Antibody, heavy 227, light 205 residues
Framework: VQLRESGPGLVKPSETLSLSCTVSQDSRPSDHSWTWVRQSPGKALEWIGDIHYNGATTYNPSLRSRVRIELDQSIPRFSLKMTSMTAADTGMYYC???????????????????????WGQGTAVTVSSASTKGPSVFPLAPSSKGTAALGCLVKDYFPEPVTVSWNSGALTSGVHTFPAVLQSSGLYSLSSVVTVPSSSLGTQTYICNVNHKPSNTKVDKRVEPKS | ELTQPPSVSVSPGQTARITCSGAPLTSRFTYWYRQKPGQAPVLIISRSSQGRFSASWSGTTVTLTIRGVQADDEADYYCQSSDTSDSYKMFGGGTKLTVLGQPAAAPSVTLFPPSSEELQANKATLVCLISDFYPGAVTVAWKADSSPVKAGVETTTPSKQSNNKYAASSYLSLTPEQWKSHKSYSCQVTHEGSTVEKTVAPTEC
């Protein structure tokens, strides 16, 4: 079972957040409570609400007047809308399956939650009046002179995050993508480095795949040895 | 609301106990989750019916017990329930579990000079990448030749790695002329009273 969030990355203050979560490989989806949770930076998880296939929803009482969850059973995919966004709402938004086990008559309450057992990876939501900006990607060439470190410098993007893969996901060993720095300009930059065998520097092509969903931009940058 | 202790510290091999307290807990089941920095939560105590993790109920408190604690158990632990009236669900405030006695680890430092491509775009960034240090505190100083750099430095807070060591990044912004004007630049990383210094030079390959 896999859950995958999609969101806009950035919401303007006072505007409405719209997120979705696509569920794959669940063979009894109608049994479960499809849930949204969020987490402000450095703070606790906060339950937002859930929905069942019968359409029944429940919501956090402090957020109820601002939120709505909906469910498209044909995919299946469920959604969150949250009105009147402000910086107080910036954070990571997770979808989750609050799985249910049924032991008797549902109308007599003979069922229980197993727990929120499958989680999405989260979608970052930043509330700001600033414009989205995609990254500029520069190669960090390997030392000319065992192992060598090479990488990509991902400069000047907003909002978070960027994700970085190498060779379209074929290269995972030795990859270290560092958390971003926030510049005085209000843009972020980060670096992703991979430690590779020196003998491969002649033979193996290395490409960092930098995805910035908020700007609908992906950059695949070839990283070659220094001239 | 559900209340948890902010922090629990234990040594390796010992048993940790984390409490969750609240009015709903007398009648509503308490689920437990673990979340490591940079990761989504993981369910660790489910309701299986009407191996190191277990939970025990007593009145308004449920206790999570972790047997045989090891460094890989460092994480934030959250309890979760529903209110007595069956109207909503809620999480506790979380407990950070610290495992004592982890050995110190010195930082590895990699310093990259500006790329030719960036210089042609009229910018220059030196990239100092710092990894595998413990505890999670470093200080970073930059030098142009032998003189301290007073501007253009941006350094991240340390972040916890998957191996429970920490990482940080420091960037120095220069104009291309400044980069070419000095014999070398250095990133100097101090941790636990000792320092690793890496240098790069415009005329060097």
């Amino acid at each position: 079972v896999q859950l995958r969030e999609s969101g806009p990355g950035l919401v303007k203050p006072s505007e409405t957040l719209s997120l979705s979560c696509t569920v794959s490989q669940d063979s009894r989806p109608s049994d479960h409570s499809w849930t949204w949770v969020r987490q402000s930076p450095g703070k606790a998880l906060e339950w937002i609400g859930d929905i069942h296939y019968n359409g029944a929803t429940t919501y956090n009482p402090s957020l109820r007047s601002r939120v709505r969850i909906e469910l498209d059973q044909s995919i299946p995919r469920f959604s969150l809308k949250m009105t009147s966004m402000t910086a107080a709402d910036t954070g990571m938004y997770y979808c989750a399956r609050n799985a249910i086990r049924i032991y008797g008559v549902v109308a007599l309450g003979e069922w229980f939650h197993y727990g929120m057992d499958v989680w999405g990876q989260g979608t970052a939501v930043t509330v700001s009046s600033a414009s989205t900006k995609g990254p500029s990607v520069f190669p960090l060439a390997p030392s000319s002179k065992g192992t060598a470190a090479l990488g990509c410098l991902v400069k000047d993007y907003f909002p978070e995050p960027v994700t970085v893969s190498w060779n379209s996901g074929a290269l995972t060993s030795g990859v270290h993508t560092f958390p971003a720095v926030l510049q005085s300009s209000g843009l972020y930059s980060l670096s992703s480095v991979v430690t590779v065998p020196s003998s491969s520097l002649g033979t193996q092509t290395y490409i960092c795949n930098v995805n910035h969903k908020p700007s609908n931009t992906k950059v695949d940058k070839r990283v070659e040895p220094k001239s | 609301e559900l209340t948890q202790p902010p922090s629990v510290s234990v040594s390796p091999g010992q048993t940790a106990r984390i409490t969750c307290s609240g009015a709903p807990l007398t009648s509503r089941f308490t689920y437990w989750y673990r979340q490591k920095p940079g990761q989504a939560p993981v369910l660790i105590i489910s309701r299986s019916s009407q191996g190191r993790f277990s939970a025990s109920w007593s009145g308004t408190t449920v206790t999570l017990t972790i047997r045989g604690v090891q460094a890989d158990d460092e994480a934030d632990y959250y309890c979760q329930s529903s209110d007595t009236s069956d109207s909503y669900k809620m999480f506790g405030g979380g407990t950070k579990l610290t495992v004592l006695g982890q050995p110190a680890a010195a930082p590895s430092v990699t310093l990259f000079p500006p790329s030719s491509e960036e210089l042609q775009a009229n910018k220059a960034t030196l990239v100092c990448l710092i990894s595998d240090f413990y505890p999670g505190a470093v200080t970073v100083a930059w030098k142009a030749d032998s003189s301290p750099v007073k501007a253009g430095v941006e350094t991240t807070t340390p972040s916890k790695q998957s191996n429970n060591k920490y990482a940080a990044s420091s960037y120095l912004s220069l104009t291309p002329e400044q980069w070419k004007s000095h014999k070398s630049y250095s990133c100097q990383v101090t941790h636990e009273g000792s320092t690793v210094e890496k240098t790069v030079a415009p005329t060097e390959c």
